[PDB]
């Protein structure tokens, strides 16, 4: 069940996002702006289709997908990837593949907060969000 992930989420803490972006080859100026931007994640459901929006003053993205079914995605940093999102241990696990590389975006609810763990190479970033009323 994906339902406790649904809603509007505001970033309240970030650890090692620069390391994660740098590992992906993101340029210094984008990392600089990204490091001070407050993003919002919106997750909504219509039947088996999830839509995940990222809104900010800098980058904005939107994806729609069915759990367990691969989809094409063009990321905020312009990578063209093959993606799949699955529930695993109650976590929303998003795997992206491109050029033989992989990165995971794992979302877990802890005490009503959404904890996003981003891993690429050796870099591990933890971004925490709080629900908007
Ligand atoms: O969407 S994210 O998943 O964070 C994202 C994931 C992976 C790489 C990213 C690189 C630059 C900016 C992002 N987003 C961003 C969006 C709004 C504000 C600041 C950064 C990246």
From Swiss-Prot:
<comment type="function">
    <text>FABPs are thought to play a role in the intracellular transport of long-chain fatty acids and their acyl-CoA esters.</text>
</comment>
<feature type="modified residue" description="N-acetylvaline">
    <location>
        <position position="2"/>
    </location>
</feature>
<keyword id="KW-0597">Phosphoprotein</keyword>
<feature type="modified residue" description="Phosphotyrosine; by Tyr-kinases">
    <location>
        <position position="20"/>
    </location>
</feature>
<feature type="modified residue" description="Phosphoserine">
    <location>
        <position position="83"/>
    </location>
</feature>
<dbReference type="GO" id="GO:0050873">
    <property type="term" value="P:brown fat cell differentiation"/>
</dbReference>
<dbReference type="GO" id="GO:0071073">
    <property type="term" value="P:positive regulation of phospholipid biosynthetic process"/>
</dbReference>
<feature type="binding site">
    <location>
        <begin position="127"/>
        <end position="129"/>
    </location>
    <ligand>
        <name>octadecanoate</name>
    </ligand>
</feature>
<dbReference type="GO" id="GO:0070542">
    <property type="term" value="P:response to fatty acid"/>
</dbReference>
<dbReference type="GO" id="GO:0055091">
    <property type="term" value="P:phospholipid homeostasis"/>
</dbReference>
<feature type="binding site">
    <location>
        <begin position="127"/>
        <end position="129"/>
    </location>
    <ligand>
        <name>hexadecanoate</name>
    </ligand>
</feature>
<dbReference type="GO" id="GO:0008092">
    <property type="term" value="F:cytoskeletal protein binding"/>
</dbReference>
<dbReference type="GO" id="GO:0070538">
    <property type="term" value="F:oleic acid binding"/>
</dbReference>
<dbReference type="GO" id="GO:0005634">
    <property type="term" value="C:nucleus"/>
</dbReference>
<keyword id="KW-0446">Lipid-binding</keyword>
<feature type="modified residue" description="Phosphoserine">
    <location>
        <position position="23"/>
    </location>
</feature>
<dbReference type="GO" id="GO:0050543">
    <property type="term" value="F:icosatetraenoic acid binding"/>
</dbReference>
<dbReference type="GO" id="GO:0140214">
    <property type="term" value="P:positive regulation of long-chain fatty acid import into cell"/>
</dbReference>
<dbReference type="GO" id="GO:0046320">
    <property type="term" value="P:regulation of fatty acid oxidation"/>
</dbReference>
<dbReference type="GO" id="GO:0008285">
    <property type="term" value="P:negative regulation of cell population proliferation"/>
</dbReference>
<feature type="binding site">
    <location>
        <begin position="127"/>
        <end position="129"/>
    </location>
    <ligand>
        <name>(9Z)-octadecenoate</name>
    </ligand>
</feature>
<dbReference type="GO" id="GO:0005829">
    <property type="term" value="C:cytosol"/>
</dbReference>
<feature type="modified residue" description="Phosphothreonine">
    <location>
        <position position="8"/>
    </location>
</feature>
<keyword id="KW-0007">Acetylation</keyword>
<dbReference type="Pfam" id="PF00061">
    <property type="entry name" value="Lipocalin"/>
</dbReference>
<dbReference type="GO" id="GO:0015909">
    <property type="term" value="P:long-chain fatty acid transport"/>
</dbReference>
<dbReference type="GO" id="GO:0005324">
    <property type="term" value="F:long-chain fatty acid transmembrane transporter activity"/>
</dbReference>
<dbReference type="GO" id="GO:0006631">
    <property type="term" value="P:fatty acid metabolic process"/>
</dbReference>
<dbReference type="GO" id="GO:0009410">
    <property type="term" value="P:response to xenobiotic stimulus"/>
</dbReference>
<comment type="similarity">
    <text>Belongs to the calycin superfamily. Fatty-acid binding protein (FABP) family.</text>
</comment>
<dbReference type="GO" id="GO:0070062">
    <property type="term" value="C:extracellular exosome"/>
</dbReference>
<keyword id="KW-0813">Transport</keyword>
<dbReference type="InterPro" id="IPR012674">
    <property type="entry name" value="Calycin"/>
</dbReference>
<dbReference type="GO" id="GO:0032365">
    <property type="term" value="P:intracellular lipid transport"/>
</dbReference>
<dbReference type="GO" id="GO:0042632">
    <property type="term" value="P:cholesterol homeostasis"/>
</dbReference>
<dbReference type="GO" id="GO:0016528">
    <property type="term" value="C:sarcoplasm"/>
</dbReference>
<dbReference type="InterPro" id="IPR000463">
    <property type="entry name" value="Fatty_acid-bd"/>
</dbReference>
<feature type="modified residue" description="Phosphothreonine">
    <location>
        <position position="30"/>
    </location>
</feature>
<keyword id="KW-0963">Cytoplasm</keyword>
<dbReference type="GO" id="GO:2001245">
    <property type="term" value="P:regulation of phosphatidylcholine biosynthetic process"/>
</dbReference>
<protein>
    <recommendedName>
        <fullName>Fatty acid-binding protein, heart</fullName>
    </recommendedName>
</protein>
<dbReference type="InterPro" id="IPR000566">
    <property type="entry name" value="Lipocln_cytosolic_FA-bd_dom"/>
</dbReference>
